[PDB]
């Protein structure tokens, strides 16, 4: 699973997290590596899946999403994988995985308001076979943002 | 807090989540809007903070990070804000906020292995005044990735 | 959903929470606004649903109700709305809503004694399809009263 | 503590919960009891504290309050009474009491938005000596309203 | 439900808790009341059910019972009463009732050893329709004994 | 700790749990053992502590106690024994021990009403050094009674 | 169940826990007991089952197992024994028993990595009839090792 | 940390878990490898720490230990490592590590009876600085044994 990375790969990844739209000319000047080996190394990082893709990181509060929430899901053990497959199709779901501990499934969701949160949980998620329970924790403030998939509804 | 957005702004945001390195020429062709109004609208989205920035979205598993975890933190009520300020300085911390529910603080962290996770929790976080308890849930698989800040240690 | 309110509307709402039977003559003298615009503004607040209605606020302990309790209900996710619809028909139920967190449904109930509480939970609520569990917290003292619907059994 | 009530008292209480502004003339016609004994019985109910007072029952969502929440508070056992005394002074707090179970103190609060909820919990409640922990459950919908004290901030 | 008691009744109850085999002659001397009114008052206390009966209070540890445990039972809400009826038939069960809180049913049991505890829980209680879960808390020491029904197996 | 018991001892214990005031004449007739060996065996059971004593078993509901409750206590680990010593002095406390599990101390209490329960928990128990938390479960009905120490306040 | 042991048996057991491959010659010299009575006593300890067997105690981390975890299992009460029988067949399971408390079944498992842990829980354990829930706690460091059954997959 | 192992190493480890006292002559015959390379490979496994040591695996129930328990420990975050260091010195503690989840520290202990368990928890563990809480789960039956360090008190 791990892809071999060297010092130059990590330097490129650091710059492309500073500014995802950085030119390979600018990376080249800053790490004293040829534009050409920069370009080739980025194409390999993408080809290998180290870079899934590039994105605009959106502030959902500024975009008019009032509700960013973490939902902990309890699911029938034999249905956990199928429940994750169904959850992944909703554009409200930003982050989704299977976890150790007291809950089986962990997700982050972004919705416009509390009535949209309740519709999402009770009219969409609750119809998935195998969901026994949900526990929603609503962010009241965010110090460090992750990734929000927004306006895909 | 909400910034006024129209149909064209949302279209641009959708494309810039598809490919964060999309040229304004390419957005212009795809939404039949001038490169020039595309450029001006993106500069306003960034200026207003709707777009925090652009980034490479990294697969931490492929980058050699074996541990992606959610940590729920219980903190002395009067210290919650100060605890968040201290937590935000660690490059292991990808996502960090204050939440409603049974826990006060929610975060995602990315570390190389279980011994790095324990060092992070017991030799870094545990020295913060006001942390009473931590509960770590380790991702065993991720269906939908968020945002990982990686190689900043 | 929000109804537009100005300074005078809020002043009227403050007085009508001080004394729900306050004459529009008395409100008029106290906020130096005409009885006539007071009357018209109250009719609009009621028409718009800002004022649901006026009520006597009853002390259930003084009325002979010994048990004021909060019940947290866990329900099958797909049945939560239908469970709330059935719960709303009981006159024991004063306050009833859907909530984020560890429980799905939150309610306040008022009953005469512990045997009436057990009959309510086990012979009325428990027959509702979709209720998995109830957790009752009994008020031993009330510092600030809400609203009790009483003698409707 | 219980005040002696008869059939006519309960009939009056039922009507004054139907419409808190009902004339004693109207109650008199509906229960075939003299306006005069109606008036005297209501004055005794108020004098005895059975009727705390009359109020407008406000829909906080329509009044522009987006957040109606139940907060469960864990407090140092020796400080529970003093914590309740301090909590009672905030106009955000609608309902407040001491409870049996896993939490010591139960309250309902009404605030304008999530940032006001966090300020209330972390900059007001958290400064009270003896509060160890809070757990907030946010109403996403209300089927049966209680009592909200609003515009007193 | 409450049976009318006076000063002399309470005095008799105090003495009959000091020594359940106390003669009415001895009670008569100690409270300066006639043996005859003592006898008549005890017959009424028994007839009315204030005194369920008299018993030897046994130390189960000294009787060779190593395990005195409290079991909290979670039951399907619609089956709680029937579950209690079935539980009451086992002679291992000393105390049994329905409770407010996180559990539905509370009991104390006395068994000879850990293998008898597991047989009781898994081969007797677990076959009752409606039991979803049990949580056993084993007494490691008893400061104040209640009542143990022993040698009835 | 275990005291040696034979078939006749167990037979006597069974009868003295049927009726704690049973004459040794009556036990003698029912188990075909001499009154004299019956008497000697009971004196040894008491001397050895197998029989702590005899008591009237009281129905607290009929005696006017409305509240029979189980309280789970969380205590500082180093103070658990001292907390039990202090708890044992209250006549409200019927049963008291140290337990395995999520709570340290388990007790049953009997008080007249909810205001007496709150005074007991907050003005008596809460002043004990080392009590961190209490969780009270109130009996709404009792199928099998234990032992209540009553009228000792 | 207990097998009679004397001073010499316990001395032999202490030495055979120091070094499971200790010669009976070496035990004989160290406890000043004949090789022959040492041999006979060890054969009886094995025959009686006091010594289940001898084993190499393996460090799973050094053997390339990255994941040593404790799994708490919640099971339908009537199926707990059958669930344990099925769990015992997996070579990943090192320690397995039935427990008092909030969980029914407790086990330790050893697997190569997080993806093997998830496959074990979701594709093997989850197919067992009667498993309602699992809670995995992953060891981040071990101060005192138990017993790991390794390379049996 | 991982030590390089081949097919022959794993075969030797499998046999030395079957019988920890197996002669290298017997391993040699069973895997068709020279006694001499068997001996050298075992000396390297021990030298590298893959084999911590060899031991008799004892059945504590047969050895007269009635109580095998798992204890979950909650500790002040800054003291977790020091608490583990102190816990490791007790011979009652068989297995001890730091864990992810709701508890910080996990251990297995073996003691003779319930009074020894309470003395261990309250007079030994509870005196360790930083222990906030313990939760003991007692094994009622063991299907698969781990490792018990016994008679070292
Ligand atoms: C793979 C983990 C599963 C889903 C569960 N949360 C557990 O801890 O065992
Ligand atoms: C702002 C929320 C705080 C931190 C706490 N989690 C609560 O629910 O009340
Ligand atoms: C709408 C909320 C639902 C009912 C659940 N309590 C949760 O937190 O996810
Ligand atoms: C009066 C009740 C106290 C505050 C606590 N909640 C208990 O159940 O014991
Ligand atoms: C009657 C009480 C029921 C059984 C449940 N324990 C509750 O608290 O609501
Ligand atoms: C003796 C038991 C202590 C008090 C705690 N309840 C535990 O389970 O470990
Ligand atoms: C035998 C114990 C069962 C499985 C459950 N854990 C209880 O505590 O009652
Ligand atoms: C290293 C883990 C710590 C001790 C805690 N149990 C947590 O999950 O975060």
**What is d(CA A98, CA B137) in angstroms, rounded to the nearest whole number?**
9
For residue G81 the two structure tokens come to: 């024994």
Ligand 8 contact, H98 CB (< 6 A): yes
Diameter over CA atoms, chain H: 55
How far is D14 from D27, CA to CA, in rounded Å? Answer: 10
User: SS3 of A89, please?
Assistant: coil
H140–E66 CB contact, under 8 Å: no
Q: What's the rounded Cα separation, in Å, for the pair H21 and G54?
A: 6
Ligand 7 site, residue E121, Cβ cutoff 6 A: yes
| Calpha distance F144→F59 (Å, rounded) | 11
Nearest to A104, CA basis, from D138, B110, G132: G132
By three-state DSSP, how is residue H35 classified?
Answer: helix
In angstroms, the CA F81 to CA F97 distance is: 10
Q: Which residues contact E32 (CB under 8 A, 6 or more apart)?
A: none
Residue D75 phi/psi, 5-degree rounding, is -135, 155
Distance, first Cα to last Cα, chain F: 33
Interface C:G, ≥3 CB–CB pairs < 8 Å: no
E138 → closest Cβ in G77, G98, G100: G100
**What distance in Å separates the CA atoms of residue C148 and residue D137, rounded to the nearest whole number?**
21
Residue B65 near residue B91, CB atoms below 8 Å: no
Containing H152, the helix (H) or strand (E) segment is none
Give one DSSP letter per residue of D12-78, joined into a string.
Answer: HHHHHHH-TT--HHHHHHHHT--HHHHHHHHHHHHHTTSEEEEEEEE-TTTTT--EEEEEEEEE-GG
Q: What subunits make at least 3 CB pairs under 8 angstroms with A?
A: B, C, D, G, H
Which residue is listed with tokens 């928990």? Answer: F121
Dist CA H27 CA C32 (whole Å): 103
| Cα angle H146-H151-H153, degrees, rounded to a multiple of 5 | 115
Cβ neighbourhood burial of C51 (10 Å; 0-12, 13-18, 19+): buried
Degrees, nearest 5: CA angle D97-D99-D101: 155
Q: CA–CA separation, E104 vs D113, rounded Å?
A: 37
Question: Structure tokens of B76?
Answer: 């002395």
To the nearest whole Å, the CA of A102 is away from the closest chain H CA by 8
* A113 reaches B (C-beta below 8 A): no
Q: Determine the Cα–Cα distance for residues D67 and C100; give it in Å rounded to an integer.
A: 12
Yes or no: say if E104 and C121 are a contact pair by the CB < 8 Å rule.
no
Distance between CA atoms of residues E111 and E71, nearest Å: 13
Reported residue count of chain H is: 153
Q: Compute the distance between CA of residue H118 and CA of residue H140 in angstroms, rounded to an integer.
A: 17
Backbone φ, ψ for residue C33 (5° rounding):
-135, 140
For chain H, count helices (H), then strands (E): 5, 5
C80 touches C106 (CB < 8 A)? no
The dihedrals phi and psi of C120, each to the nearest 5 degrees, come to -55, -50
- Residue B99 CA to ligand 4 center (angstroms) comes to 25
Kindly give the distance from the C-alpha atom of residue F100 to the centroid of ligand 6, in angstroms, as a whole number. Answer: 4
Give the DSSP letter string of B75-111.
E-GGGHHHHHHHHTT-TTEEEEEEESSS-SEEEEEEE
Which atom number of ligand 8 is nearest to the Cα of residue H101?
Answer: 8
User: Kindly report the CA angle at B91 between B87 and B94, in degrees rounded to 5?
Assistant: 75
Contact F145, F57 (CB under 8 A): yes
> Nearest C-alpha to atom 4 of ligand 5 is from which residue?
E104
As given in the structure block, the two tokens for residue G149 are 């059954």
3-state class percentages of chain C: helix first, strand second, coil last, to nearest 5: 40, 30, 35
Contact A66 D113 (CB under 8 A): yes
| Structure determination method | X-ray
Task: Give the CATH fold of the F7-47 domain.
Answer: Arc Repressor Mutant, subunit A (1.10.10)
Q: Which two tokens stand for residue D132?
A: 């160890």
Cβ–ligand 3 contact at C16 (below 6 Å):
no
Q: Whole-angstrom Cα distance, residue H4 to residue E113?
A: 48
What CA–CA distance (Å, rounded) separates G31 from H122? Answer: 35
The string over C12-33, giving b where at least 16 C-beta atoms fall within 10 Å of a residue's C-beta and e elsewhere, is bbbbbbeebbbebeebbeeeeb
Listed in sequence order, the DSSP H helices in chain E are: 7-18, 24-31, 35-47, 80-87, 114-119
At G42 the three-state DSSP class reads helix
3-state secondary structure of E1: coil
**How many degrees, rounded to 5, is the angle at CA D139 between CA D135 and CA D145?**
120
F109 DSSP β-pair partners? F69, F93
Interface check F63 vs C, CB under 8 A: no
Give the tokens for residue E9.
Answer: 């009744």
Rounded-to-integer distance, Cα E116 and Cα E95, Å: 18
SS3 E116: helix
Closest C-alpha among A65, A75, A119 to residue A96 = A75
- Calpha distance E132→G100 (Å, rounded): 15
Mutate to test the interface with G, among A72, A77, A103 (most CBs of G within 10 A): A77
Contact G100, H69 (CB under 8 A): no
**Consecutive H or E run containing A28:** helix A24-31
CB atoms within 10 A of CB A112: 15
DSSP assignment letter at E59:
-
Structural tokens at position B123: 């030799």
Rounded distance between C-alpha atoms, residue H135 and residue H101, angstroms: 14
Q: Please compute, for residue F12, the number of CA atoms within 13 A of its CA located in the half-sphere on the CB side.
A: 27
E130, E82 contact by CB (below 8 A): yes
Which chain B residue is nearest to residue C100, measuring alpha carbons? B101
**Does the CB of D138 have a partner CB in chain B at under 8 Å?**
yes
Angle at B40 between CA B35 and CA B41, to 5 degrees: 95
* Degrees, nearest 5: CA angle F139-F145-F150: 85
How far is the CA of H134 from the CAs of A86, F74, F100, G143, H94, in angstroms? 39, 10, 9, 18, 16
> CB A13: neighbour CB atoms within 10 A?
22
Question: What is the Cα–Cα distance from G43 to H72, expressed in whole angstroms?
Answer: 37
- Distance, in Å, from the CA atom of E18 to the CA atom of E20, rounded to the nearest integer, reads 7
CA end-to-end span of chain H: 33
- Among D140, D127, D141, D144, residue whose Cα is nearest residue D90: D127
Q: Helix crossing, E24-31 with E35-47: angle to 10°?
A: 110
The residues, any chain, with a CB within 8 Å of residue G6's CB and separated by 6 or more, are none
C76 lines ligand 3 (CB under 6 A): no
Q: B29 Cβ partners below 8 Å, 6+ apart?
A: none
User: What contacts A39, CB < 8 A, 6 or more positions away?
Assistant: A24
Domain locations along chain F: 7-47, 67-138
Q: Chain D residue closest to F139 (CA)?
A: D100
Which residues are paired to A144 by β-bridges?
B96
Q: In terms of DSSP H, where are the helices of chain H?
A: 7-18, 24-31, 35-47, 80-87, 114-119
Instruction: Give dist(CA H61, CA H110) in Å, integer.
Output: 9
Instruction: Indicate yes or no: CB of G102 within 8 angstroms of CB of F102.
Output: yes
Instruction: Give the one of H66, H115, H140 whose C-beta lies nearest to E118's C-beta.
Output: H140
Q: Which of E134, E137, E138 to mutate to test the pocket of ligand 7 (most atoms within 8 A of CB)?
A: E134
Residue H100 to residue A102, Cβ atoms within 8 A:
no
Give, as one character, the DSSP assignment of residue C4: P
Helix (H, G, I), strand (E, B) or coil at E48: coil
Taking the alpha carbons of H76, H78, H83, H84 in that order, is the dihedral positive or negative?
Answer: positive
Distance C108 CA to ligand 5 centre (A): 14
| DSSP track, F64-122 | T--EEEEEEEEE-GGGHHHHHHHHTT-TTEEEEEEESSS-SEEEEEEESSHHHHHHIII
Asked if A100's CB is within 8 angstroms of H100's CB, the reply is yes
Of the candidates E97, E102, E104, the one whose C-alpha atom is nearest the C-alpha of residue E131 is E104
Architecture of the CATH domain D67-138: 2-Layer Sandwich (3.30)
CA distances from G26 to G50, H26, H58 (A): 21, 22, 20
Alpha-helical runs (H) found in chain B: 7-18, 24-31, 35-47, 80-87, 114-119
Token pair for H104: 């910080």
In angstroms, the CA C145 to CA C138 distance is 14
* Measured CA distances, G117 to A73, A90, G110 (Å): 19, 27, 8
Distances (CA, A) of D5 to B56, C67, C113, G39: 73, 18, 17, 89
E126 contacts G77? CB cut-off 8 A: yes
Ligand 4 geometric centre to CA of F105 (Å): 15
Which among B114, B115, B140 is the nearest to G115, CB-wise? Answer: B140
Q: If you count them, how many residues does chain E have?
A: 153
Look-up of token digits 């480890």: H13
Q: What is the resolution of this structure in A?
A: 2.0
What lies within 8 Å, CB to CB, of C2 at 6+ separation is: D61, D62, D63, D64
Interface contact G81-E127, CB threshold 8 A: no
Q: In whole angstroms, what separates CA F37 from the centre of its chain?
A: 29
Our CA dihedral for C58, C62, C65, C71, rounded to 10 degrees, sits at 60
CA distance D21 to D17: 9
* G106, H139 Cβ separation under 8 angstroms: yes
Q: Which long-range contacts (CB under 8 A, 24 or more apart) does F128-131 make?
A: F128/F83, F128/F86, F128/F87, F129/F79, F129/F82, F129/F83, F130/F75, F130/F76, F130/F78, F130/F79, F130/F80, F130/F82, F130/F83, F131/D77, F131/F73, F131/F74, F131/F75, F131/F83
User: What percent of the residues of chain A are helix, what percent strand, and what percent coil, each to the nearest 5?
Assistant: 40, 30, 35
> Facing residues of A96 across strands?
A107, B144
Strand partners, F111: F67
* Dihedral sign from CA coordinates of D107, D108, D114, D119: negative
Say how many C-beta atoms besides its own lie within 10 A of residue C40's C-beta: 12
Cβ contacts of B14-19, under 8 Å, gap ≥ 24: B14/A151, B14/A152, B16/A55, B16/A56, B16/B42, B16/B51, B16/B54, B17/A55, B17/A56, B17/A58, B17/A149, B17/A150, B17/A152, B19/A53, B19/A54, B19/A55
Strand partners, A111: A67
User: The dihedral of CA E140, E142, E148, E150: what is its sign?
Assistant: positive
How many residues in total does chain A contain? 153
Could you give phi then psi for residue B40, rounded to 5 degrees? -70, -40
């Amino acid at each position: 699973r791990k892809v071999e990375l060297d010092e130059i790969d990590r330097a490129i990844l650091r710059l492309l997290q500073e500014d995802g739209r950085m030119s390979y000319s600018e990376i080249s000047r800053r790490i004293n590596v040829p534009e050409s080996t920069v370009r080739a190394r980025v194409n390999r990082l993408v080809k290998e899946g180290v870079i899934r893709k590039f994105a605009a990181l959106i502030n959902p509060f500024k975009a008019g999403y009032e509700i960013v929430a973490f939902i902990a899901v309890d699911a029938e053990p034999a249905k956990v994988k199928q429940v994750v497959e169904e959850l992944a199709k909703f554009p409200e779901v930003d982050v989704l995985g299977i976890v150790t501990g007291a809950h089986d499934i962990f997700m982050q969701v972004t919705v416009k308001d509390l009535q949209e949160l309740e519709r999402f949980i009770l009219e969409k998620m609750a119809k998935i076979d195998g969901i026994k329970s949900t526990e929603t924790s609503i962010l009241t403030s965010v110090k460090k943002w992750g990734y929000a998939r927004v306006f895909h509804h």
